[PDB]
């Protein structure tokens, strides 16, 4: 199946040429023009194929974060997105990732976020005198985060005229309040907001943090909890840092986060870090799983196993077992990271 001949390579965004960057960006725009597949009565707010991906994430958020299926489900998700870009948008380039480490002293100068024509758009319109973001996970003390250097709609770049249609589902706001639609799958068109927060990166996504994550995680449990943020440490891990550092809407919504176009580059890096960690010890780590099928095991559910079946709903793909997802060179996958 996976052979040296049909091996694809996943590459840092900093390693894409100007022409390669736009090829990718244009593909994603093409996803935002194509009509949605999700049946209107299940997600009335859906319009585009991109919406289809956003909807499944909202629909499944409760069963795909702090579960045994978190890493694998996301690996599939971004895989089937890539497959959309290829099969429907005629993309023939490589899957990009966002190397957090390289932008942690100055996020506004990040090639992902410089706001130029080769970025995923940039900062939001500056809003002064904003309160702090307070994240409560469960019932531990809230983590305190700076509001960032934007806050309003994105000012420049290829996604300035991009309409976000679904959400908000649980959007953290400056000051600590939280916006939640009666149901986030209905039509609520608005612009993508961002408030770039370099400080957040300084705390959680520096190169020391990333290496620590890889080298000090003895078991999948330790790995995936350190990545997501062990509730009660005041860490939100690399995965939280990457999300909240984008600020804005839906940067700060756990459910609607794919609504931000940097999601895919963010999760490319998640997948890369995971893949790396796995490969330090394939015999024990290749197929390791820990956790249940529910967020923090609340309500309790069965332990996830290789036999556990997961899907992307109407976004793309079909039902697929976990044993088919454990390797980037097995099942439906045949790629590495450079």
Ligand X SMILES: *[C@@H]1O[C@H](CO)[C@@H](O[C@@H]2O[C@H](CO)[C@@H](O)[C@H](O)[C@H]2NC(C)=O)[C@H](O)[C@H]1NC(C)=O
Query: Does position 59 bind ligand NAG by CB under 6 A?
Result: yes
Residue 61 engages ligand X in binding (rule: CB under 6 A): no
Q: How many CB atoms lie within 10 A of CB 295?
A: 18
177 binds ligand NAG per the rule CB under 6 A: yes
Q: Tokens for 244, please give them.
A: 């909240």
Is 267 labelled a binding residue?
yes
24: nearest Cα among 154, 158, 123: 158
Q: Which of 43, 135, 145, 236 binds ligand X (CB under 6 A)?
A: 43
Three-state SS at 255? coil
Comparison of 4 and 300: residue with beta carbon closer to ligand X: 300
Q: Least distance in Å: CB of 204 to a copy of itself?
A: 18
Would you say 266 is a known binding-site residue? no
Terminal Cα-to-Cα distance of the chain (whole angstroms): 21
9 in contact with a copy of itself (CB under 8 A): no
How many chain residues bind a copy of itself (CB under 8 A)? Answer: 27
Q: CA nearest 289: which of 12, 53, 42, 71? A: 71
Q: Which stretch binds a copy of itself (CB under 8 A): 75-83, 158-166, 293-301, 323-331?
A: 293-301
41 labeled part of a ligand binding site: no
Measured CA to CA, the distance from residue 268 to residue 24 in angstroms comes to 14
Residue closest to ligand NAG, measured at CB:
313
Site mask for a copy of itself (CB under 8 A), range 66-85, x = bound: x-------------------
User: What, of ligand X, a copy of itself, ligand NAG, none, does residue 4 touch, CB below 5 to 8 Å by kind?
Assistant: none
Contact between 69 and ligand NAG (CB under 6 A)? no
Breaks (C-N over 2.5 A) in the chain follow: none
Q: Stretches 60-68, 87-95, 202-210, 266-274: which one binds a copy of itself (CB under 8 A)? A: 60-68
8 Å CB contact between 88 and 31: yes
Cβ atoms of residues 127 and 175 within 8 Å: no
Task: Mention every residue, 6+ apart, whose C-beta is less than 8 A from residue 62.
Answer: 294, 295
């Amino acid at each position: 199946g996976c052979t040296l001949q049909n091996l694809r390579v996943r590459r840092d965004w900093r390693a894409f040429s100007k022409t390669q960057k736009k090829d990718y960006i244009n593909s994603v725009l093409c996803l935002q023009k194509l009509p949605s597949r999700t049946p209107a009565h299940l997600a009335p707010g859906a319009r585009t194929r991109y919406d289809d991906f956003v909807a499944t994430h909202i629909n499944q958020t409760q069963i795909i974060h702090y579960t045994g299926t978190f890493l694998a489900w996301h690996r599939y998700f971004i895989y089937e997105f890539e497959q959309a870009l290829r099969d429907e948008c005629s993309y023939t380039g490589d899957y990009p990732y966002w190397n957090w480490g390289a932008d942690a002293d100055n996020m506004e100068k990040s090639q992902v976020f410089d706001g130029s024509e080769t970025s995923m758009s940039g900062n939001g319109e500056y809003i002064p005198n904003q309160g702090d973001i307070k994240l409560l996970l469960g019932n531990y003390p809230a983590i305190d985060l700076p509001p960032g250097s934007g806050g309003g709609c994105v000012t420049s770049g290829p996604f300035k005229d991009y309409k976000l249609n679904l959400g908000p589902a649980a959007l953290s706001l400056p000051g600590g309040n939280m916006t939640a639609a009666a149901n986030p799958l209905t039509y609520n068109p608005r612009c993508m907001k961002r408030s770039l927060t370099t400080e957040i990166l300084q705390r959680y996504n520096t190169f020391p943090k990333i290496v620590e994550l890889i080298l000090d995680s003895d078991d999948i449990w330790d790995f995936q909890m350190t990545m997501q943020g062990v509730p009660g440490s005041g860490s939100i891990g690399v995965h939280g840092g990457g999300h909240y550092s984008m600020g804005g809407d839906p940067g700060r919504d756990v459910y609607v986060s794919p609504g931000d176009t940097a999601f895919w580059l963010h999760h490319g890096m998640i997948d890369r870090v995971w893949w790396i960690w796995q490969n330090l010890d394939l015999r024990k780590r290749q197929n390791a799983i820990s956790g249940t099928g529910t967020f923090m095991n609340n309500p309790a559910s069965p332990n996830t196993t290789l036999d556990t079946v997961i899907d992307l709903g109407y976004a793309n793909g079909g039902p697929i077992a976990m044993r088919d997802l454990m390797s980037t060179t097995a099942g439906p996958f045949c790629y590495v990271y450079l």
